[PDB]
Amino acid sequence: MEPAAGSSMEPSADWLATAAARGRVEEVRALLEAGALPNAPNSYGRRPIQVMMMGSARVAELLLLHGAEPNCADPATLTRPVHDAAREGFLDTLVVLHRAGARLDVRDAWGRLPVDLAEELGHRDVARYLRAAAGGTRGSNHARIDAAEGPSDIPD
Structure with a gap:
């Protein structure tokens, strides 16, 4: 019932993802190399990089070079970390994921x-390299077999 303050030998564990999301490459570079856990249980049901500052492929590299979860996503929203790169209009992040085992077609x-x-946003440059690694099919004026993928029922 009474929590204590202190009594810990270098509590470095979730400080890796945190810094990443706060645009802190030097914070993680030191932590990550000090033993930061890339597969640490984040509190946002997200990943070690999916939460990193997407405006700095440098961070993702720190977690990726170490072994983050550039492929794994969320079993609830399946938000793949590959969107964080393109969604933020960052291409250097996508290449990195692909450069270190990372599915980009989910x-x-x-x-x-x-x-x-x-x-939708405005990262055609990031979506381009994506449409290539995100599925072999690549038809601009074509159309696979009628297979709407989403919620049942298709209300016009």
């Missing part, structure tokens, strides 16, 4: 894709 639990999200 679909958020809803029914979207990492390449489509970029076509």
Whole structure:
């Protein structure tokens, strides 16, 4: 019932993802190399990089070079960390994921894709390299077999 203050030998563990999300490359570079856990249980059901500052491929590299979860996503929203790169209009982040084992052809639990999200915001440059690694199919004026992927029922 009475919590204590202190009594810990270098509590370095979730400080890796935290700094990443706070645009802190030097904070993690030191922690990450000090033993920061890349697969640490984040409190946002997210990943070690999916939460890092997407405006700095340098961070993702720190977690990726070490072994973050550039592929794993969320079993609840399937928010793949590949969207964080394109969604933020960052391409250097996507290459890194692909440079170190990272699936970039998945679909958020809803029914979207990492390449489509970029076509909405304004990262066509990031969505381009994505449509290539996010599925072999690449037809501009074509259309796979009628298979709406998402919620049942299709209300016009």
